[PDB]
Amino acid sequence: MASRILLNNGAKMPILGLGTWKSPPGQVTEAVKVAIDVGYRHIDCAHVYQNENEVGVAIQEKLREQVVKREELFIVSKLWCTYHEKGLVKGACQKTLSDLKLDYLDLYLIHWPTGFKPGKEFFPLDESGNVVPSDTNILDTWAAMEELVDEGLVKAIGISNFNHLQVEMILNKPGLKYKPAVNQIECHPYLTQEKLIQYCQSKGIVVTAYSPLGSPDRPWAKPEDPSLLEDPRIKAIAAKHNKTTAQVLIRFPMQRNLVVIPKSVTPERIAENFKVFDFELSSQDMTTLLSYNRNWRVCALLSCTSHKDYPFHEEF
Numbered sequence: 001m002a003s004r005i006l007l008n009n010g011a012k013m014p015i016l017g018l019g020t021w022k023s024p025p026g027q028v029t030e031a032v033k034v035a036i037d038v039g040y041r042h043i044d045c046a047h048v049y050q051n052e053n054e055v056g057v058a059i060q061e062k063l064r065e066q067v068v069k070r071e072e073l074f075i076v077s078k079l080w081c082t083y084h085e086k087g088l089v090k091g092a093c094q095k096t097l098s099d100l101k102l103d104y105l106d107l108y109l110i111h112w113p114t115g116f117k118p119g120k121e122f123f124p125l126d127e128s129g130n131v132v133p134s135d136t137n138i139l140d141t142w143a144a145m146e147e148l149v150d151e152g153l154v155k156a157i158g159i160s161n162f163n164h165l166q167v168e169m170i171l172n173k174p175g176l177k178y179k180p181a182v183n184q185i186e187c188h189p190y191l192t193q194e195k196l197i198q199y200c201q202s203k204g205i206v207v208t209a210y211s212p213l214g215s216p217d218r219p220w221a222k223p224e225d226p227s228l229l230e231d232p233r234i235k236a237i238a239a240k241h242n243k244t245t246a247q248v249l250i251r252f253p254m255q256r257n258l259v260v261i262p263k264s265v266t267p268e269r270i271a272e273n274f275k276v277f278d279f280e281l282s283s284q285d286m287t288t289l290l291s292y293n294r295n296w297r298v299c300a301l302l303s304c305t306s307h308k309d310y311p312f313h314e315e316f
């Protein structure tokens with residue numbers, strides 16, 4: 001099991017990253033520092049998570065302590081939907097570089113394929129609770145992302161929550177300069193993404209699995225929702241290998257040649273989640289876990305189901 005995966009730009013991406021969604025500002029700085037001390041070399045971020053400054057502080061501290069060099073870190077961020085307009089993309093990236101205190105990003109993703117009306121609101125809603133979309137399309141935005149690569153501001157560009165038709169639009173774009181290196185998508189035993197994974201890997205596109213633990217801290221969780229961490233079937237697989245349920249959940253996407261970005265702001269869990277290179281799930285274990293699929297999404301973007309570019313109407 002290699003700890004990194006070769007990307008289609010030539011760079012190697014560490015297959016284990018720290019997620020930072022819902023990491024509060026007054027705790028994410030310590031989280032990132034503990035991550036780096038423990039051995040994480042991949043931090044996944046986004047403007048919309050409202051904590052990039054605080055991630056920036058932590059990276060800078062560890063660079064100045066000389067625990068890591070910058071070229072050893074792989075730092076990812078995402079362009080939020082309100083900045084899909086072509087002329088706003090660079091501004092958005094620069095705002096993120098400035099908060100992270102970096103001169104370059106290793107990877108910059110289009111966060112969602114849906115463009116929202118520009119402004120102060122992250123989710124500019126209408127009367128009905130539906131997002132006001134921007135008069136934008138995916139191809140023009142991709143063109144703006146490509147300029148970021150040409151300027152050296154980002155080493156790789158990518159997409160997140162794109163379906164295979166949307167990825168295909170980019171790949172078939174007239175005058176394409178850069179293929180996306182990565183598709184970042186929800187993926188866990190309840191949403192196993194077999195068809196999207198097969199498509200992406202066949203196109204040389206690396207897949208990053210998000211919400212690998214089932215995002216137990218998600219703000220909209222309901223008591224009826226299934227719970228990966230509490231599944232006694234997954235607990236027995238963990239008990240079998242003398243590991244924890246979270247460790248099994250993290251390791252699972254790794255053996256599928258995926259990148260995985262579990263989130264924690266608890267030092268002890270940050271360390272636990274890292275200890276996933278010392279065991280192996282069996283073939284039987286993998287087939288078992290794959291059979292738990294139930295097309296269940298944490299992030300279904302339900303305010304945008306009328307948006308022309310809503311990703312999740314299509315099968316995959």
Ligand SMILES: NC(=O)c1ccc[n+]([C@@H]2O[C@H](COP(=O)([O-])OP(=O)(O)OC[C@H]3O[C@@H](n4cnc5c(N)ncnc54)[C@H](OP(=O)(O)O)[C@@H]3O)[C@@H](O)[C@H]2O)c1
Pocket residue numbers: 018019020021022044045111160161184185209210211212213214215216217229246247261262263264265266269270272273298299
């Ligand atoms: N591209 C997108 O649209 C998108 C969408 C969603 C997520 N993501 C990315 O993927 C990252 C992870 O997804 P996620 O944050 O939704 O949820 P997740 O990583 O599946 O789960 C986070 C929850 O798991 C808990 N946890 C972590 N390790 C644990 C352990 N060993 N034992 C018990 N509980 C543990 C955390 O608690 P504590 O924090 O209290 O320790 C937190 O509440 C996100 O942070 C973000 O970077 C991207």
